[PDB]
Amino acid sequence: FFHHIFRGIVHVGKTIHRLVTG
């Protein structure tokens, strides 16, 4: 529950960083 919710936060950074970093 906690790890799942937190995990989603990291994923949001992966896509955003991927797009920004190309």
Identity of the residue numbered 15: T
Distance CA 4, CA 8 (A): 6
Distance CA 21, CA 5 (A): 25
* φ, ψ for residue 14, nearest 5 deg: -65, -45
Question: Would you state the structure tokens that stand for residue 18, as one six-digit string?
Answer: 């991927």
* Residue 18: alpha-carbon gap to chain centroid: 10
Question: Would you state the structure tokens that stand for residue 4, as one six-digit string?
Answer: 């799942």
What kind of experiment solved this structure? Answer: NMR
